[PDB]
From a paper:
CD40 is a 48 kDa type I transmembrane protein that is expressed on a wide range of hematopoietic (B cells, monocytes/macrophages, dendritic cells) and non-hematopoietic (activated epithelium, endothelium) cells. Engagement of CD40 by CD40L expressed on T cells results in the production of proinflammatory cytokines, induces T helper cell function, and promotes macrophage activation. Disruption of this signaling pathway has the potential to reduce production of proinflammatory cytokines, reduce T helper cell function, and inhibit macrophage activation, making it a very attractive therapeutic target for patients with chronic inflammatory disease. Therefore, we determined the crystal structures of ABBV-323 (antagonist) Fab alone and ABBV-323 and FAB516 (agonist) Fabs complexed to the 3 extracellular domains of human CD40 along with in vitro functional assays to better understand the protein interactions that govern agonist and antagonist activity of CD40 mAbs.
To further support this idea of a non-signaling dimeric state, we examined several variants of ABBV-323 with small changes to sequence in LCDR1 including changing position (L)R32 to proline (FAB516) or leucine (FAB518). These changes resulted in conversion of the antibody from antagonist to agonist activity as demonstrated in a human CD40 reporter assay. To confirm this hypothesis, the crystal structure of agonist FAB516 Fab complexed to CD40 was solved to 3.1 Å resolution. When overlaying the backbones of FAB516 and ABBV-323 CD40 complex structures, the CD40 monomer recognition for both Fabs is identical. However as predicted, the crystallographic dimer formation is different. When generating the symmetry equivalents of the FAB516 complex structure, an antiparallel CD40 dimer is again observed however the second CD40 monomer is in a different orientation when compared to the CD40 homodimer in the ABBV-323 complex structure. A PISA analysis for the FAB516-CD40 complex calculates the crystallographic CD40 homodimer interface to have a smaller buried surface area (1397.6 Å2) and a smaller predicted ΔGdiss (2.5 kcal/mol) when compared to the values calculated for the ABBV-323 complex suggesting that the FAB516 CD40 dimer interface is less physiologically relevant. Most importantly, the FAB516 Fab binds predominantly to one monomer of CD40. Specifically, LCDR1 (L)L32 does not engage in interactions with a second CD40 monomer for 4 out of the 5 Fab-antigen complexes in the asymmetric unit. The structure of ABBV-323 demonstrates a unique method for antagonism by stabilizing the proposed functional antiparallel dimer for CD40 receptor via novel contacts to LCDR1, namely R32. This was further supported by a closely related agonist antibody FAB516 which showed only monomeric recognition and no contacts with LCDR1 due to a mutation to L32 on LCDR1.
Author numbering:
A (entry chain A): 1 to 130, 137 to 219
B (entry chain I): 24 to 106, 108 to 121
C (entry chain B): 1 to 219
Write the structure that this text describes.
């Protein structure tokens, strides 16, 4: 299918530099105009730059003029954004979006956090249960966003709720994922939450199970 | 017989022209219809035509003090202006302070 | 730079009804050449990129259902979602496709109005693992409720707590339109072993009366 896949985001110190990549598949990459578009956490969409399909003409948004540089490698089916001297107003999710007079296909985005601070991997704790039973995971004290939680490696998805993270007094982030399952399957079926926090290279599988007395 | 509006003649055959934004890849025949193809993302053709190649879009170098007044479409070329700045030539290929 | 300004900022519409989001631009978006108005509508469901709905102000993208309709001309346009559907819940953006820089509207959060549904409350004691580090998180879960207004009150040994808790709410579900909420009371291991009964009291329109769920520390 038509695909755009961004990579190269992460945590970065202010005034430092970062290079984003977008790997295209499913279409004649050389035929389309390629765009970068960003969305700061909580805010709306900001078009960042454009690169044409013909003689690869380039346009930029003023707010990145002089600092970002867009380019493409049609042989490699890749689009690139070299971001230089990142101020912290650059923190956003950066979207890859092809265009033929409108952005009709977008990537899933990669996150870029322009921060004073260091990465901190989350700590994962069970939420064990007592018709329907609820169980879950507390993913506590991490920086920066995002953590992604899955259940049974992607097999359990019905009734999963992963709550938006909250900012803790401590400066760090914490969230929880919960799921409701048949009570009859509590002794039989194994429930595992899988937490990935990329910027700290943290992959954790906590096996939530009912506590014994 | 003479050709109707928006048609062209090729070997005493009245063929339909190509609508704007589209270039010709095949003249018609007594029984098939003229075969056109859309212009490229960075390409345009502004008239009913039997051209075989689209035209490339105007680029608006910001070095030359240009802003894009209207973006290029497949049936219209880009339109460019200056922005603060004031244009030198009447055709406005470049600007100045 | 063109400026796209949307109205309303926020809109709640019942199922089946017609939603109306408006957009005004500072310039005109009419290409006098091909006579097209270069306005574009996007839908952004959460955790997803924006999804193209309508371009050229009125032409619908392929696969967009007929209940999505674009209208307008010049500097004033409209996206009209008629026969509103559970999965229509998103943020909608209009977008200047006329020139560079390409500029979006600020957003319109569409909510789906739904019948009353009571929360389903669960209480979660802290893990022994979390205690071994000196902190105690106690989670209350309000699962699948509507409308969004719900009061959660923590109580330790009937003592009404304040200040030591944080709320989190999921986005409105695309199938059943309910919300979900979690409240987390955070204490030190010290302060947490000083008491026995931990409870949360939920108050919501769908319930008959405020619901409490609790546990005794240790059992």
């Amino acid at each position: 299918e038509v695909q755009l896949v961004e990579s190269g985001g992460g945590l970065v110190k202010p005034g430092g530099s970062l290079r984003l990549s977008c790997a295209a598949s499913g279409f004649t990459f050389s035929d389309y105009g390629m765009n970068w578009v960003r969305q700061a956490p909580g805010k709306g969409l900001e078009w960042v730059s454009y690169i044409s399909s013909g003689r690869s003409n380039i346009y930029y948004a003023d707010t990145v003029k002089g600092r970002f540089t867009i380019s493409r490698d049609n042989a490699k089916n890749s689009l690139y954004l070299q971001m230089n001297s990142l101020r912290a107003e650059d923190t956003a999710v950066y979207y890859c979006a092809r265009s033929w007079g409108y952005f009709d296909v977008w990537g899933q985005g990669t996150t870029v956090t322009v921060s004073s601070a260091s990465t901190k991997g989350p700590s994962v704790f069970p939420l064990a249960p007592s018709g329907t039973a609820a169980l879950g995971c507390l993913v506590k004290d991490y920086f920066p966003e995002p953590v992604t939680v899955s259940w049974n490696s992607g097999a359990l998805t019905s009734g999963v709720h992963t709550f938006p993270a909250v900012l803790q007094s401590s400066g760090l982030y914490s969230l929880s994922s919960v799921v409701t399952v048949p009570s009859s399957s509590l002794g039989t079926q194994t429930y595992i939450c899988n937490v990935n926090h990329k910027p700290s290279n943290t992959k954790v599988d906590k096996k939530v199970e009912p506590k014994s007395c | 017989t003479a050709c109707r509006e928006k048609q062209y003649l090729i070997n005493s055959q009245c063929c339909s022209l190509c609508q704007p934004g589209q270039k010709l890849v095949s003249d018609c025949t007594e029984f098939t219809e003229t075969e056109c193809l859309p212009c490229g993302e960075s390409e345009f053709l502004d008239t009913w035509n039997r051209e075989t190649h689209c035209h490339q879009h105007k680029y608006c170098d910001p070095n030359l003090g240009l802003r894009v007044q209207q973006k290029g479409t497949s049936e219209t070329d880009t339109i460019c202006t200056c922005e603060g700045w004031h244009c030198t030539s009447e055709a406005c290929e470049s600007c100045v302070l | 730079d063109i400026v796209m300004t949307q109205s309303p900022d926020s809109l709640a519409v019942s199922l089946g009804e017609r939603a109306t989001i408006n957009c005004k631009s500072s310039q005109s978006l009419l290409n006098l050449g091909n006579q097209k108005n270069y306005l574009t509508w996007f839908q952004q469901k959460p955790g997803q990129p924006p999804k193209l709905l309508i371009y050229w102000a009125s032409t619908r993208e392929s696969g967009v259902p007929d209940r999505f309709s674009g209208s307008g001309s010049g500097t004033d346009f409209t996206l009209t979602i008629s026969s509103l559907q559970a999965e229509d819940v998103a943020v909608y953006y209009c977008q200047n496709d006329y020139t560079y820089p390409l500029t979006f509207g600020q957003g319109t959060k569409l909510e789906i109005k739904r019948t009353v549904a009571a929360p389903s409350v669960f209480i979660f004691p802290p893990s022994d693992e979390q205690l071994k580090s000196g902190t105690a998180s106690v989670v209350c879960l309000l699962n699948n409720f509507y409308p969004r207004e719900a009061k959660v009150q923590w109580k330790v040994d009937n003592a009404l707590q304040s200040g030591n808790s944080q709320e989190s709410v999921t986005e409105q579900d695309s199938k059943d339109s309910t919300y979900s909420l979690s409240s987390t009371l955070t204490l030190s291991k010290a302060d947490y072993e000083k008491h026995k009964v931990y409870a949360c009291e939920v108050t919501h329109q769908g319930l008959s009366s405020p619901v409490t769920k609790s546990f005794n520390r240790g059992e």
